[PDB]
Structures are given as C-alpha cells and as structure tokens.
Amino acid sequence: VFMNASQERTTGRQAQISNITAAKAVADVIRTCLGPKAMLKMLLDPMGGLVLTNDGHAILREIDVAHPAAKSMLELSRTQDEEVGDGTTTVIILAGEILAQCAPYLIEKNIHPVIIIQALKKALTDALEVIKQVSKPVDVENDAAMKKLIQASIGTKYVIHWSEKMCELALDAVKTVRKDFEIDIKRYVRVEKIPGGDVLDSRVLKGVLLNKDVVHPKMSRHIENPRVVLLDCPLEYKKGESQTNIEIEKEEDWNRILQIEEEQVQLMCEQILAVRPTLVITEKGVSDLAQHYLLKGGCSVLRRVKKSDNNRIARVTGATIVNRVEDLKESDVGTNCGLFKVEMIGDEYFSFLDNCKESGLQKACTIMLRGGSKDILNEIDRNLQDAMAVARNVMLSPSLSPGGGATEMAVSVKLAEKAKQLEGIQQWPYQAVADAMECIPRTLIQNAGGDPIRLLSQLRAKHAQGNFTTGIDGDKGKIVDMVSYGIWEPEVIKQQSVKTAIESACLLLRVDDIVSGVRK
Amino acid sequence: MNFGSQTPTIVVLKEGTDASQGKGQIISNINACVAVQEALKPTLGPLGSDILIVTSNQKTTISNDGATILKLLDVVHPAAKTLVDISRAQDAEVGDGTTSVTILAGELMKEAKPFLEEGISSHLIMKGYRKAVSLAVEKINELAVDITSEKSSGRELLERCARTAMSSKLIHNNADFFVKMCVDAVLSLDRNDLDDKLIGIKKIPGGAMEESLFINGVAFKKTFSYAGFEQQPKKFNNPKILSLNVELELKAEKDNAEVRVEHVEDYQAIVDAEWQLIFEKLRQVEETGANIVLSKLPIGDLATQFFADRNIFCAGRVSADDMNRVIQAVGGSIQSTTSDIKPEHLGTCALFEEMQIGSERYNLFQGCPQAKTCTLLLRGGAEQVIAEVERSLHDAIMIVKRALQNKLIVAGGGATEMEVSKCLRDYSKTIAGKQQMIINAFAKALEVIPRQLCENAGFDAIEILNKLRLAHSKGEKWYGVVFETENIGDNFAKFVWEPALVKINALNSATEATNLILSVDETITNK
Amino acid sequence: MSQLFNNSRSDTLFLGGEKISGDDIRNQNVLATMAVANVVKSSLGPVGLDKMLVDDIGDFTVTNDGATILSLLDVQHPAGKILVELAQQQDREIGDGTTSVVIIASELLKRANELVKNKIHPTTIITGFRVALREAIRFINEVLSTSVDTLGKETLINIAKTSMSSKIIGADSDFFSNMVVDALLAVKTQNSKGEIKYPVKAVNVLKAHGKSATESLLVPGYALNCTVASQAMPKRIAGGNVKIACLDLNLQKARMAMGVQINIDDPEQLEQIRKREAGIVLERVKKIIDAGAQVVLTTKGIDDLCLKEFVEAKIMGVRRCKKEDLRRIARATGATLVSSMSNLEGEETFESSYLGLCDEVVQAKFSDDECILIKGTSKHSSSSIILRGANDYSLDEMERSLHDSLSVVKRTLESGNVVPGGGCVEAALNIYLDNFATTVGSREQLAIAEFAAALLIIPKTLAVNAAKDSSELVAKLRSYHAASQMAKPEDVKRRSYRNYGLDLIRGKIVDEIHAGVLEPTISKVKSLKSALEACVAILRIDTMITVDPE
Numbered sequence A: 001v002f003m004n005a006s007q008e009r010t011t012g013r014q015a016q017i018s019n020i021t022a023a024k025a026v027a028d029v030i031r032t033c034l035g036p037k038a039m040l041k042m043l044l045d046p047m048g049g050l051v052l053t054n055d056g057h058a059i060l061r062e063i064d065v066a067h068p069a070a071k072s073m074l075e076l077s078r079t080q081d082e083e084v085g086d087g088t089t090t091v092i093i094l095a096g097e098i099l100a101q102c103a104p105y106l107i108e109k110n111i112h113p114v115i116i117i118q119a120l121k122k123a124l125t126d127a128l129e130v131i132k133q134v135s136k137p138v139d140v141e142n143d144a145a146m147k148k149l150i151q152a153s154i155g156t157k158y159v160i161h162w163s164e165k166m167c168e169l170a171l172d173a174v175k176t177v178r179k180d181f182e183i184d185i186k187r188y189v190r191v192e193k194i195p196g197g198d199v200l201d202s203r204v205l206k207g208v209l210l211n212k213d214v215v216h217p218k219m220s221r222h223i224e225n226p227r228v229v230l231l232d233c234p235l236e237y238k239k240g241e242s243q244t245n246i247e248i249e250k251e252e253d254w255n256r257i258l259q260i261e262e263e264q265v266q267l268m269c270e271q272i273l274a275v276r277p278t279l280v281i282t283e284k285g286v287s288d289l290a291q292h293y294l295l296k297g298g299c300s301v302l303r304r305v306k307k308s309d310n311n312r313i314a315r316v317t318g319a320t321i322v323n324r325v326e327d328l329k330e331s332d333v334g335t336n337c338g339l340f341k342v343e344m345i346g347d348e349y350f351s352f353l354d355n356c357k358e359s360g361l362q363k364a365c366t367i368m369l370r371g372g373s374k375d376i377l378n379e380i381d382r383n384l385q386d387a388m389a390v391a392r393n394v395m396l397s398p399s400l401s402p403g404g405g406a407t408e409m410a411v412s413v414k415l416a417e418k419a420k421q422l423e424g425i426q427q428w429p430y431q432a433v434a435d436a437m438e439c440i441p442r443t444l445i446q447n448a449g450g451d452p453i454r455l456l457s458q459l460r461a462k463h464a465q466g467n468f469t470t471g472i473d474g475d476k477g478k479i480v481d482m483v484s485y486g487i488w489e490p491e492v493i494k495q496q497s498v499k500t501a502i503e504s505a506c507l508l509l510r511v512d513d514i515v516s517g518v519r520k
Numbered sequence B: 001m002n003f004g005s006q007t008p009t010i011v012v013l014k015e016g017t018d019a020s021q022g023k024g025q026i027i028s029n030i031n032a033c034v035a036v037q038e039a040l041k042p043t044l045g046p047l048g049s050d051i052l053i054v055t056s057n058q059k060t061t062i063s064n065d066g067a068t069i070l071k072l073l074d075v076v077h078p079a080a081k082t083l084v085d086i087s088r089a090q091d092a093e094v095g096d097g098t099t100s101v102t103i104l105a106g107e108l109m110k111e112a113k114p115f116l117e118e119g120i121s122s123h124l125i126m127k128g129y130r131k132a133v134s135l136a137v138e139k140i141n142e143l144a145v146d147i148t149s150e151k152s153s154g155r156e157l158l159e160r161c162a163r164t165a166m167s168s169k170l171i172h173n174n175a176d177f178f179v180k181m182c183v184d185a186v187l188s189l190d191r192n193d194l195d196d197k198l199i200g201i202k203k204i205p206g207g208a209m210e211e212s213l214f215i216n217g218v219a220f221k222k223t224f225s226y227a228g229f230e231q232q233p234k235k236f237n238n239p240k241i242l243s244l245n246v247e248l249e250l251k252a253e254k255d256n257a258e259v260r261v262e263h264v265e266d267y268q269a270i271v272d273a274e275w276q277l278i279f280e281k282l283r284q285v286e287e288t289g290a291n292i293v294l295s296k297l298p299i300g301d302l303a304t305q306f307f308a309d310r311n312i313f314c315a316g317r318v319s320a321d322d323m324n325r326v327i328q329a330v331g332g333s334i335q336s337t338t339s340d341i342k343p344e345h346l347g348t349c350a351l352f353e354e355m356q357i358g359s360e361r362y363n364l365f366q367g368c369p370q371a372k373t374c375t376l377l378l379r380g381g382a383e384q385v386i387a388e389v390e391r392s393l394h395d396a397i398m399i400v401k402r403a404l405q406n407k408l409i410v411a412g413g414g415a416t417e418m419e420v421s422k423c424l425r426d427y428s429k430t431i432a433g434k435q436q437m438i439i440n441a442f443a444k445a446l447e448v449i450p451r452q453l454c455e456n457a458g459f460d461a462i463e464i465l466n467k468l469r470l471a472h473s474k475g476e477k478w479y480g481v482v483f484e485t486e487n488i489g490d491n492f493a494k495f496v497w498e499p500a501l502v503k504i505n506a507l508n509s510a511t512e513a514t515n516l517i518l519s520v521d522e523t524i525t526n527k
Numbered sequence C: 001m002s003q004l005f006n007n008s009r010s011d012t013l014f015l016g017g018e019k020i021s022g023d024d025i026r027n028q029n030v031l032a033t034m035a036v037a038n039v040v041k042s043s044l045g046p047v048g049l050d051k052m053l054v055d056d057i058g059d060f061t062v063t064n065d066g067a068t069i070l071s072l073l074d075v076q077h078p079a080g081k082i083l084v085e086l087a088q089q090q091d092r093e094i095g096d097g098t099t100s101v102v103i104i105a106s107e108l109l110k111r112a113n114e115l116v117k118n119k120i121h122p123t124t125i126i127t128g129f130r131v132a133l134r135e136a137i138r139f140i141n142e143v144l145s146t147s148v149d150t151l152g153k154e155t156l157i158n159i160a161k162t163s164m165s166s167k168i169i170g171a172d173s174d175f176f177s178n179m180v181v182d183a184l185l186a187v188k189t190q191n192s193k194g195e196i197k198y199p200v201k202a203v204n205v206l207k208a209h210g211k212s213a214t215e216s217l218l219v220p221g222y223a224l225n226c227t228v229a230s231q232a233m234p235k236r237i238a239g240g241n242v243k244i245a246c247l248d249l250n251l252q253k254a255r256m257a258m259g260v261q262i263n264i265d266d267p268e269q270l271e272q273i274r275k276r277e278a279g280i281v282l283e284r285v286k287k288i289i290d291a292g293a294q295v296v297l298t299t300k301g302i303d304d305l306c307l308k309e310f311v312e313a314k315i316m317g318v319r320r321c322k323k324e325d326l327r328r329i330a331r332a333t334g335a336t337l338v339s340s341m342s343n344l345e346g347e348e349t350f351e352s353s354y355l356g357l358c359d360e361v362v363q364a365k366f367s368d369d370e371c372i373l374i375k376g377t378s379k380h381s382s383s384s385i386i387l388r389g390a391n392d393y394s395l396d397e398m399e400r401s402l403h404d405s406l407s408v409v410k411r412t413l414e415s416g417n418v419v420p421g422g423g424c425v426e427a428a429l430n431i432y433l434d435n436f437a438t439t440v441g442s443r444e445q446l447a448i449a450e451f452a453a454a455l456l457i458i459p460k461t462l463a464v465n466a467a468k469d470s471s472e473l474v475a476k477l478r479s480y481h482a483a484s485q486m487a488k489p490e491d492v493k494r495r496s497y498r499n500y501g502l503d504l505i506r507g508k509i510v511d512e513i514h515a516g517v518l519e520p521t522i523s524k525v526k527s528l529k530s531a532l533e534a535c536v537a538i539l540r541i542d543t544m545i546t547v548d549p550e
C-alpha cells in the first residue's frame, strides 16, 4: 500500500455528477419550505430536543450531512442569515438548481468548467443591473409602508394570523435600537420568552426583564423613580490574589480579623450610600451581611447578573458600569427609570424596569412573547428575527425590489434576450442561468396546486408587455402584479440570493477528484 | 406511501463488482502486460536464462520459451491473458518466437504510454499500428531470397535452419549430435502430410542426452507382460508384425450372456466350447506366420500361453496414438477379425531387438527403409531436462516442418527488426501528421528484440544500436549482432537462417494483441 | 507493477522488515512517484481542476495549491516524503512553481528509471542532467526581458494575473490585480542600508462571507481582528492624529512573585495591602490616560477593573491579539512596542513618543464579525484585504490564492528581469538541449536528450486538462521554437517567433506579451535545482531497508 489514499477513487465526469446529485438533494428537502403555503419540517437532534420550522436555515443546520460537496450547501445557510437573515431557503433552492440547470453539460457537450464560470461571472453582473432597474425606492419614514414590508417574511410563517400585531412589535424594536448611518445590531435585542399566555397580550417593553426576585422582604418592589447603579465587584469579602496568612500572637487579634470583615464590607456600603441608589445590581454574588447596611439606606440588592445583561441595563437607564466602589460618582448613576415592579408567575419571578422614554447612546429594549408552549415560543422568535431583519435592509438600502418571484423571473427574461445576441461559445452557459432563475417562481405554483406549464407561459408573456411587477400569487395561484398585491421585499435580500448562489456554484464546478478519510 | 422505515438506494451493478473507466483503466491494463513481460525479457536470446516455476500441486516444470511459462501460472487479470493467447497461437501455428511475440506486443503498449498521457485518444493510436503492420509484412517478403536460385542441396537447407532454434536451450553445446536427429525425423514423414503426433517423444528417466538414438521404427514400450513373457525371444530377424483391434480374453469385457443347460451331458460341451472358440482365433494367427502380435485391448493368458511355444511375441494394452503410429511403418493396417487376416496386411523389418534402459524395456523396430514415421528416445540426469529437451526438439522440428512447405530465407538475431524499422522511418517523414510519431514509435518498438540480445550478453545496448543505425544507413541486409565474435556483422555469412513464418506472425500477433487492449477503456469484473 | 513479491532468503537475515534490492526498488520509487504526481497533474494550469480531501471529522479542504494537497497527504513510502517536502520547500522560498516542480521531478524519475534499464550508469545519467542544467540556466539568462516603455503598474498587474489563474480568483483576477500590487507597495520598507525588502504575510487577510468577491474592499491601512473589551466604548474615533498605544502589559489583578510569602501580625494591615494590589496597576494606567491616548492596544487580557477608567476617559480598550500583528501597527503609526514599561531612571514614567499617529481608528462590522480598521497611518503606510465569498471553505482557498499572488509580485520587484510563461520556457529549453550534447555525444548524449524531453511534461499536461488536442499544440511549439534557434542577430524576423505559444483558453498560438501572462525569473531558477536534488537522491538508491518499529 501507499500513504493514506485510494480505496475507490472517483475520477472523470462521475465525480462532478456526484457533486451535482448530492447538492441537488439538499434543495429537494426544503423544496416544500418555499412559499406562503409551505409546510413544516420536524427535526430530531441527538440531544433529545425538537426543532420544527419551515426556515431552511434551521433545517439544514441541525441535519448532519456527510458528503464533501453536499456540506458546502449547508454552509450557504449561515451566509444569508449572518449577513441579512432573510432568504435562507431561497438561496439553497436557487444554488441547488443553478448547479443542475447551468451544468447538465460535460455529461453531453463536454464543456470545460472554467468556460462556464466565465459566463457565470458575466451573468452575475447583468443580473444585478436588472434588479436595480426593477427596484422602486420607498420612503423609510412612512410607518404604513414599513408595516407592509415586514409582513413579506411573515406571509410564509405561522404568525401571519398575528401579522397585524407582529408588525407593531418588529417596527418598534428596530426603531429603538437604531442609532443616528442608522446602524443597528441584534445583540442588544433580547430574545427572552415567557411560557404560556396570549399572543395578543405580548408587547415590546423598554428595559431589561430580570428573572430574579428581590433579595430581602423589606426591599421595595414598587419604586416611582428607580436609580440603578451597576457594580461588577462582589459585595462579599475579597480574599485577594495572595494569601494573607495572619500570624496571631495574642487572642485579641483573631477577633479583630472577623471584626474588620464586617467593617470592611460596611466601608464599601457607606460609599454606595453617597449616591443613595434605589436599586443596586451586582454582577457577582452578594453576602447577607452587605444587604443590611444597604437596606438601611434604601438600596436594593439583587442576585448575581450575567455580563450580557449588564450591558443592556446601562443603555436603558444611561448608567455607567462602575467596578470600583470608591470611584463611584453621581454622574455614573442611572436615572429616568419609569417603573420597577415584580409580577408573580409560577415558573419564576420577573422584575420589570421601565424607561421614561425622554441624541446619545442607542436605547435597549426587550421583547416579551406569550405563546402556547415552549416550542411555539422558539418558532415565533425565529420569525421575529426574520421579520426584524427586513427593516434593517430598507434603512441602509432604501431601494425596494419586487417580490413574489418577480425578481427572479425578471432576470430570466433579460438573460434570454441577451443569450441570442451574445452568441459565441458562452451562449449555452449564459442561457442556462435563466432556466435556473425561473425555478423559484415555479416552486410557488407547485406548492399552491396549480399548473406550472400554463401559468409560467403567461407570466413570461405578460412580463414584457404588462410591467416588471407581474408575479405569481401565493394563495390563489393566479397572475397578479406586485403593485396591487401590496407586498414587497428589499433589494439586499435579492442581491444576496443571486451572488451567494452563483459564487458557490463556481466552487463545485472546479472539483476534479474526491478522496475521503485522508487523515486528521 | 412507502412500505416502512427508510429505503436504501439500489446500486446499479451487483454488490462486489469492480468497474472503473477512463484513462486510468488503460494504464492499469498496460502495466499488467508489462509486468508479465518483465519475466520474459531475460529469456530472449541464445544467452537467455530459464525460469523455475512451481505450481500449487508442487509439480516442478522448467521451460525457457514463453508459451509454457504462461501455461504454468494461472492468469487472472484480463489484459494479461492476451499475452497468453498470442503465445499459444504462436506455439500451435509455428512454435518459434513465442517469447519474442510477447516482447513485441508488450513493447507496443509501452511506447503508447506517453501518447495516452497526451490528449491523443487510443483510437488514433491504433490507426498508426494498423497502417505500419501492413507495410512491415511487405518488407519481409522483399527480403526473402529463394533457395533454389543457387541450386543448393535440400538436406543442408534444413540443417542450418534447425541449429537456429537450438539456441537458448541446453542443446546449444550438444547441437552437433542433436540436429542430425530432428533433420532426419522430418524427412521420414511425407512432404504432403506432416504430423506432430508421429514425432512424439517418450520420457525415459535417467541416462545421458548424447546417448540418444534415432531409428525410423517406433517403440510401443510395454504394459503388463502376462504369463509366458521373457521366454519369447526378444531379438528377431525378419518378423511379421500383426495388429489386432479385437480383444483376446475368456469372457472378460463381453456382456453377460445367460446360459441355461437342462442336461448334464450338454454341460460338458459348453465348457470345452469356450476352449475351442479362443483357440480358433489363436490358430488363425499362426497360419498367417505373424511373429509379432500387437493389440490395443488386453491380451488373455491363454493367448500368451499359445504364442509361448511358437516364440511369437505378443504385447497388448497399447495406446491408440501409438498403434496409429505403428500402422504407417508396417505397411498394411489393423484387421480386427482373425479369419479375415490376409498376408498383405502383415508387416516386416530388417532387424528387431528389445533392450532395457532406465530399468524399462522397449521394443524397437529397426531396419525400415519405407517407414514414414520416426521415434525419439531422450535421456538425462534430471527429469526436468528431458521435458526441456523434448520441448526444445518439438519447436526445432517445427522449423524444418514449416520450411518444406515454403522455403524463404529471413534474417535473424535482430537483423530483420532493424532493417524493417529504418524503412518505416523514411516512410514516416512524408506523413506529416499524428501518424508520424506513431510510426516512429512503432519502428522504435521493434528494436526491443536486439535490446535483450546485448543486455543478456553483458555488452552495452547503447553502443550497439549506434553502430547499427550508422551501418544501416547504407544499403544492408542480414546485418545483425553476433555473440561468438563479440562484434556485430553480417548474419548471412554466419549461415544462421530463420523461416519467414516466424517474423510474419510475430508482427501480426503483436499488433493484434496491442490494438485489443488499447480499444478497452473500461473493465468490469463481477462476483 | 510489482508482482509475486520477493522470496525471503534464510541465508540473509536482518532484524525488522525484509530487505528488497535490485530493480524492484526503482520500480517502487517511480510507482510511489506517479502516485503523488497524478494528483497534481489535473490541478495544473488555468484549465486545471483542484481536488477535495476529507479530514474524517466531516470537514474538508478545497485548494488548488499543490503544497497544501501534498502536506495533507502523509506518505509512508520513504522516497515519497521527498516530493512532499519538496512542495513545502517550494512555496516557502520562491512561493510559486509548486505544482510544476512536483511534475518536473516526477518525469525526471520516470525517464531516468527507463535509462537505468538501458544499462547506462545512474551517475552518468546524473552527470547528463547536471551538465544540461548548467547550460539551461545560461539560456534562461539570454531570454530575460527587462521591463521598458511600460505605462504605470501594468508590468506588475499583468504578472500578478498569472498566479491568480488556475485558482478560484482567476475569474475575478481583473479586479484583484490592483489590490495585490498596491498591497506590497504600501508595506515597502528599507533595510541592508538601501536595499528594498518586503514583509511576508504583513497584509492582513480577514474572512467575512457575504455579498460578492468582486466587492471586496481594499483598506488603505492595516486591519486587526479583535473584539472590543467593553461594549460601552466608542466604536468610531472622530478627528485626526489619533494616538495608538501598543502595550505588552496586561491590566489585571495580579499575584505577587511566588517567592514571596506575606505574614502579618496585625489585622489592621489587611486593608492597605489588599488595596495596594490593585493600586500598583493604577499607577501605570493613570499616566497613559493623562497622555491623551485614544486607542490602547494590549497583548494580554484586561480585567474589568481597569476597563472602568477607559469608559470615563472615552478610551477604547483592546484584549489579546497576535504578537506579530501588534508589531506592524506600532511601526506604521510611529509607536514603539513596549514589552515591559520602564525608564533609564529608577522612577516610572511615560513618554509621548511611545504613542502612534494615524488619521482615524474605526471598528466596522462585517457580517456578524467585528474588526478594527486603521486608515491613514503616519510613519509608514500599510494595507489589508478582506476576502468575501459564498462559504468559509471558499475563503480558505482565496487565502492561499492571495498568499501565492503576494509571493510572485514580491520576487518581481527584486529582479527586474522576467520570462514569458505558459509553457514557453519549457518548450524553449527542449530545442536548446536538442542541439546540445550533439558535440560531446558518446554515452552522455542519451541521458541529456531525455532531460530535454522531460521538460515537455509541463506543456503537454496543460493541454490535457483543457479537453483539447495536445498533439496539435505541441507540434506547433516545436515548429516555431526549433527553426529560430540558429538566427543571426541582424535582418530581424526570426527570433520574433519562439517567444510565445500554448494559450489554453483559445487553443491558438498567440503572443504572451500582448496577452499579459508572465512569470518572474526567480520562479524558474531553483525550481530545476530543487527538482534535480529530489531526482538525484531517489535515483542513487539501489536498496531500501525497512526496520520494524519497537
């Protein structure tokens, strides 16, 4: 034998055929996950949980696929999520069809892959210009226009029944995090969920929701104007980096050691009382001795807090995190807190911090959600992340692309017209791109139960004469225009679908041979 | 809709079937033929070395030629079986050059290795070999000189051609005595009908090779020698040879015949009746005066008892291949009816003697000038030497066998391959195409036979080929390598000659074997 | 090609594995050579295709570089490790010709092994290769072309596109050409008293998958990959002359030296000793904040104790980063890297000369990753390239695709003489060595003639991966080059040929000067020298001896 190698080496055209067949099977599973009528997929993890969603991102993430080429399709799910967050299912279906539709050849024509890649680069450039021409800008300051825009990703989800309520939650969450360009991030958006309740009763509340009850019974659970001060240091007695190792010669020295530990913690409590904070939040644990001198002055003690929640509390009340108690000043004390209350729920306690709402640092807010179970909460949370991500594209990119499969079909018509004018050896790879673009609107017909032969034939004819906004209706499976359909989608979602799908197809076409299990 | 659980995919071919396609399959098929060629490279040439092969049955067999070597080992890979077919086809048709055909067939695949690594597909490569093999055969016929133009003797013609096949064997030193045998063996056979079964050599363990003898008669050895043997004289003057296909026995191989006798007196008649039926066939043999009785079927005891008093020698259980060899030299032919035997069916000879060699007794027919058959009794120390000399003389008789049909003088020892290769290079210069590199590779592939001649001799093959191409520049023929004088020169003055059927079949078999594997780009093996 | 194995002789005994001698070793050396050679044959040339290797954990690697492919292949054959380490030596020194040197050295072993069976001695074969190589190097010096009458950077732009070919960036090589040329010119420094040298890897490669590869932005300055310590710190610094502090000193609660044991007889000393432990660190950070440093870089992690003063002073804190990354930041901005803070005097102090200078320091978020973009450096310019792709596996290939392009341009500005690529040199060295050795002749003529045809494996392999006719292109490369070797340097015409050929895209013979494909002369030299030593070492081995492990 030689090295680590051989076994059965797949060479020739069958190595690329195995790459096309395996990657095509990735889009066939979520093929029914596209459209407003899309079904759901229940996943079984090795940990014992359950994941039920129609989003191709969460479906392809938990599924373990062992194959050199097929795993590259799994990586495309996080490309759409991390950059945008909407259109993850469209990219996988498009990229899966491009590899099959743009390269049936080399099984027949024996065309070299790089020759096809050179046509894919020119087809991607022309596809971007077509999307820019069919995109009509929309005002970002219109609240009525943003509500119908968020409902785009909602129409394919289960929250479409609450869409009227859901657009209220997604618009106020993005506008609050937006800081004046207008850069926002979801790290400050809280995904915390409340089990049980009514979805209509769920609302976005400013502030941070804590799961911890007040430590002492005499701590006031109702405060008109709370004053919050954040402390990273624990209120307990610090042992120090090096051992103290006190040598006690006389019996009176040992009692002084335990007496200072009471006075040393008391010294840190007296410095806190200088700013008389109503609510004191400590990142680490707190001793039962430190809470007494804080209760005498009116300070409130809480359980240890994670580092992630300390950053959101400082944004709401404007407080500054103060580690050193001696350096604590009135300038770093948080103010303008609306209400402090604690409500009883059987699972856990909940502490509410309300903002007085009245440029500076961006405000933080939490989204309360009342579902029917624990798994329903995780489904709506994934729906909110997809719905709120739509509002981030329109603010950075006011351009608005056509939806309902009109973007992909508009490109397929322009590619077919330039395919005959280009001629050359690249006409076949260039024209084959248009055949892969019409598969996305074709899926909308197969899920609706209509005839894709007669509908797509009239869709291409009415596209040139009628307008560029003509598309497939999801519910009725008919030919309608996106102007009267009332739903649109940002251009960033369509641009990421065309770029990621084509750039990934060029990687799989360059594969010659495949060797498995070389070494680790 | 599904039956249950999950359904695995169905593989097209049966599980365990090895199938691979592309250029990598042809390279694996060529390396299978080259690996087999590596064993037959040192065997080429008069200085070639024998190969010792032991099979799974622990049966020792030593053979210099590549025909038997490939028969001993069991070949698995399909492409390696192609070299076995050309070795057996060369052996049955002619029998000489069975090793050189494998060397040429594998060298054509070796020269096609750099062509397959290029963008040239194997279909255009076969076109150059098919075109070059047609011109190479026409060159051999033009280099053949008729022997009747010089009006030489026909006996000396077969002697010089027989000594060529004796090379590379154990006969090369003893060829003085051994060539004078096989040459006289083919002259006994009819020029119109030549048979390899009549020249069959018996294996006699022990003895010396130079102690062998050649007599126009035959030897049927012996089987049992029933009661009455060793009393009969083993030396006859002018015996009458009689052969019988009928079996002489008392109710032995005859089918069971139920005999019912209702009387006691009639039972005495049937007992003496069998004695009269057996002695009736024996009495009719004596009336003809036959001193030698041969039979294919066993001989009964009463028979040998009858001929014991009459001195007539009788030996049965002789094989059919031996009896068919006897009936030719004895004149008239077997009569299986004792009452139908006529005087003209009996044989004769000038002398008959039975002598014992190697603890085995052999009846030797001697003094038969009209005998159209012959026998060869070979000896030796090892039993493997006898099998080697028998196969050495077998291929040597085939030289003088094919020479009587067609008489053509063709050069040997690398002289023919170098002359044909240069004529192909001058023709390739006018092609100006893909075939120019293929014909030049085909002419270079024909040089492999002179390669193993110098390599096995210890001399360098680079300096010899350089002296050839400079010498072949001017018009020359028969010019080749000479091992005795250590210098390369004219083989026509060396008198070494070879038949034309060896070189013509070597070029046609090597091209046919090469184009067969190169046309297969995929191999599928089930089970 | 080895059958029947070998018969173990009882008269010859050695501990460990059996000893194989004769032609079987050289047959296994070529068999092991063709095993690693056939892997890089399909990956050579713009029409070539790379291969995939599974790591058994589910992760794979897609790269066209022959060095990474051979590095991932662990060869148990003793002579097979030479070609594996040959690729790691090729990209480390020159940085180009990695796939070619493996294929050239493979054909040298295949032809020489066929010559050993011809009975010519290997040392005579080696002598023929070394004499032919000495004259081949002299021919490379004759075909050198110095850049003249060129407009702008087009000389370096056309050469950089050659290395970009055969890789995923080849289609985008038009846009990436200006990014690579401008990257190595910004890191330009001076050493050896006037000699110009360039750092390797100095250009930061950041991986963010999104948008398209053609939209990759070229930052006019260095970019560092790190996460901010405190989220309350400003991510954008407004105003010019931003002061950057490069420090190797972490700010943390630290234990006193292990050779110290604190023993106190009074409880009253526990308050001052515990407070002084954090107070010693305060003296170092206080003098830095008072100097007006906007950005403070630190090699080691910083506890939240000292991150409080950075928020009040509006100073951006930094945590653990690569040590080699912080060196080029201080050199570009003018700062001085401080391993340990000290002064010549026995008193601690901080000088303003240790602070860097730049136009601005901003933190941009690419996808979900956040990195710092430092633009407009003062003392020395810098550059960075953020690669964008569909998935992280394509970004892993673009890194090696970008790293190989930096090595080709690096060797271009060191020697102004360049040679045309695309199989032009391999076709020119063939005919030059054909007329060679004709004067000497004798036995060495055969070994030298095979060395000339051994270089033909490179131009012939390029035509196979293009699914075209190789015999049509190879016959043309021999037609234009052969007739022009005897030309006399007047009446012109003549040598105007032979300088171009073997265009894989159009399958026609076109001028490489107008096409733009060029290769540095450094990549051609030392490639045949390293391939010769790999051929000589393997050819000289008659017998391989394997010892069983204990």
Ligand SMILES: Nc1ncnc2c1ncn2[C@@H]1O[C@H](COP(=O)(O)OP(=O)(O)O)[C@@H](O)[C@H]1O
Residues within 6 Å of the ligand: A033, A034, A035, A036, A054, A055, A056, A086, A087, A088, A089, A090, A152, A153, A154, A155, A156, A402, A403, A404, A405, A406, A444, A472, A473, A474, A475
């Ligand atoms: N109600 C609808 N009718 C027709 N097409 C729709 C409808 N909703 C969404 N689509 C199309 O489906 C595509 C994907 O939308 P969506 O399902 O919200 O995202 P994802 O496929 O990532 O879940 C969009 O490009 C859009 O054109």
Ligand SMILES: Nc1ncnc2c1ncn2[C@@H]1O[C@H](COP(=O)(O)OP(=O)(O)O)[C@@H](O)[C@H]1O
Residues within 6 Å of the ligand: B043, B044, B045, B046, B048, B065, B095, B096, B097, B098, B099, B100, B164, B165, B166, B167, B168, B169, B412, B413, B414, B449, B481, B482, B483, B496
């Ligand atoms: N006396 C000789 N001088 C030169 N060459 C010879 C001589 N005898 C045989 N040869 C060459 O040696 C080769 C091998 O011959 P041999 O081994 O005897 O039979 P085969 O050809 O069947 O293997 C032949 O091709 C022939 O050309």
Ligand SMILES: Nc1ncnc2c1ncn2[C@@H]1O[C@H](COP(=O)(O)OP(=O)(O)O)[C@@H](O)[C@H]1O
Residues within 6 Å of the ligand: C043, C044, C045, C046, C064, C065, C066, C096, C097, C098, C099, C100, C161, C162, C163, C164, C165, C166, C420, C421, C422, C423, C502, C503, C504, C517, C519
């Ligand atoms: N665009 C091109 N056109 C013609 N020849 C090229 C082109 N790009 C590279 N080559 C040739 O291919 C050879 C190998 O290039 P490449 O594969 O990029 O480097 P390596 O062999 O080190 O991987 C070079 O010698 C060069 O002459």
Ligand SMILES: [Mg+2]
Residues within 6 Å of the ligand: A086, A087, A152, A153, A154, A156, A386
């Ligand atoms: Mg959506």
Ligand SMILES: [Mg+2]
Residues within 6 Å of the ligand: B095, B096, B097, B165, B395
């Ligand atoms: Mg013979």
Ligand SMILES: [Mg+2]
Residues within 6 Å of the ligand: C096, C097, C162, C163, C404
């Ligand atoms: Mg390169």
